[PDB]
Design a protein around this ligand. Structure first.
Ligand SMILES: N[C@@H](Cc1c[nH]c[nH+]1)C(=O)O
Ligand SMILES: N[C@@H](Cc1c[nH]c[nH+]1)C(=O)O
Ligand code: NI
Length: 465
């Protein structure tokens, strides 16, 4: 009828909004702020805000908003949501250095101990989406949000069932039901779309785009966006020396990968951040050099007779990652490295054991809200939530800490470029490609989001005709 089936990669365990951006993606939850289609930060649930000094954020909430269970969105509900999310999530906690929150009616006041200009931007983070902390259901299974579709049932790691929330504050949502199912294999997602088992899929493998394009019942949408694929190193393993990271950095053929593996739907990467961001000063592009890799590896004493052995993790959800792993393995052998590839079903869980891997294929949304600070804090500081390999360098830390309280934007740019320059010397990770997000749908599905932040998908205007 007007039911929509969606097939996504990257199965979840908990679907608490502070554990995953999936509730925001599928239309169940909303943050106080959002980014619009051009990537700029906008008030979402907020009616008005002010910053009377650099440690004070005053917010007035819209007055016409309910949770999906009929409860009013008040300042007190927002206070308990943010406080709960900070308590339960390191990601949220390290992005929001809030010292206190007071609330009355629709107004709340958020304080920090020192200036943190990125605070408003991080309140647009989907992990900071607002839910009813007093709801009498398990937030890990059926969180209650303000979004147009309420989560009604969750089969853990498999399927989410959602229903139209008819009192949604922006307008009557246009679908009756949404069913979301997880499928890690990109080729199966496409087969599900072609056979009409699903209506909307993300992370289309680049080698299926033409097949979908030729189908008049289907359509493909692409967006260059801000997602970067990389090779992430485990810095807790002593064999992963700077010589080893540099060697592997030179075994990668970024240009070749962008052309033949991404078939032109990507650009070769240097830093974490897409070079289409105007103020970023990218480091020099590393070009494949097998001899140099062999040389560097000799420094640590590796040879054809006694090669470096590397356990490399990969996963199917981002479909090109394992294709890259395959060519890395093949090329690395020429440089006296024996790579064992292990593909896993739950990448985030697997990487938690730092004794179980030396490097991993990976992908992250490195600049979702227009500022580089989020990435540096979560990926390059010890215990940052996406720092899977525990990279940390006190000199980089110092610049990051200075960035965090820097208000002048031109100065933020300069410090950010200094962090890029200094950290690149360490090769904390090898950034491979800035790669487009590709979404495909039945041609009857209208008004889903494919925008550069790579987070949103469903909103109250998404429909079926
Ligand atoms: N950050 C990685 C792994 C992941 C799993 N779930 C969410 N993220 C990616 O998005 O590909
Ligand atoms: N999967 C999203 C969100 C995320 C947070 N941590 C890991 N992943 C990304 O990689 O951009
Ligand atoms: Ni991710």
């Amino acid at each position: 009828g007007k039911d929509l089936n969606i097939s996504l990669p990257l199965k979840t365990k908990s679907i608490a909004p502070y554990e995953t951006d999936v509730p925001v993606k599928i239309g169940a939850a909303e943050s106080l702020f959002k980014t619009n289609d051009q990537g700029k930060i906008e008030k979402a649930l907020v009616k008005s805000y002010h910053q009377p000094n650099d440690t004070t954020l005053d917010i007035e909430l819209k007055d016409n908003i309910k949770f999906q269970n009929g409860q009013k969105l008040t300042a007190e509900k927002v206070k308990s949501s943010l406080e709960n999310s900070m308590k339960k999530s390191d990601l949220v906690k390290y992005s929001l250095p809030i010292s206190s929150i007071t609330a009355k009616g629709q107004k709340l006041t958020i304080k920090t101990n020192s200036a943190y200009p990125e605070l408003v931007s991080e309140l647009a983070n989907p992990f900071m989406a607002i839910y009813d902390t007093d709801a009498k259901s398990d937030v890990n299974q059926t969180p209650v949000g303000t979004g147009p579709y309420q989560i009604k049932d969750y089969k853990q790691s498999r399927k989410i069932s959602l229903s139209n929330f008819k009192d949604y504050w922006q307008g009557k949502p246009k679908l009756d039901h949404i069913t979301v199912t997880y499928q890690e294999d990109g080729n199966n997602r496409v087969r599900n779309l072609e056979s009409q088992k699903d209506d909307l899929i993300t992370d289309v493998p680049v080698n299926k785009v033409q097949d979908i394009e030729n189908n008049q019942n289907l359509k493909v949408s692409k967006e260059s966006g801000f997602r970067t694929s990389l090779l992430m190193y485990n810095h807790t393993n002593k064999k992963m020396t700077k010589s080893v990271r540099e060697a592997l950095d030179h075994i990668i053929d970024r240009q070749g990968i962008a052309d033949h593996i991404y078939q032109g739907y990507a650009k070769p990467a240097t830093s974490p951040f897409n070079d289409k961001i105007p103020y970023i000063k990218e480091p020099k592009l590393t070009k494949q050099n097998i001899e140099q890799a062999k040389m560097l590896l000799a420094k640590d004493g590796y040879t054809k007779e006694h090669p470096l052995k590397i356990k490399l993790i990969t996963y199917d959800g981002r479909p090109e990652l394992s294709k890259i792993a395959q060519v890395l393995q093949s090329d690395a052998k020429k440089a006296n490295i024996e790579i064992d590839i292990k593909s896993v079903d739950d990448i985030e869980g697997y990487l938690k054991d730092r004794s179980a891997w030396d490097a991993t294929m990976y992908s992250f949304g490195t600049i979702p809200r227009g500022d580089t600070g989020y990435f540096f804090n979560q990926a390059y500081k010890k215990d940052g939530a996406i720092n899977k390999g525990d990279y940390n360098n006190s000199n980089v830390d110092d610049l990051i800490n200075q960035l965090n309280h820097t208000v002048d934007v031109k100065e933020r740019h300069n410090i950010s470029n200094d962090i890029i320059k200094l950290s690149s010397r360490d090769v904390p990770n090898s950034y491979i490609a800035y790669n487009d997000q590709i979404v495909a749908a039945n041609s009857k599905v209208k008004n889903y989001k494919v925008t550069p932040e790579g987070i949103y998908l469903i909103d109250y205007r998404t429909t079926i005709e």
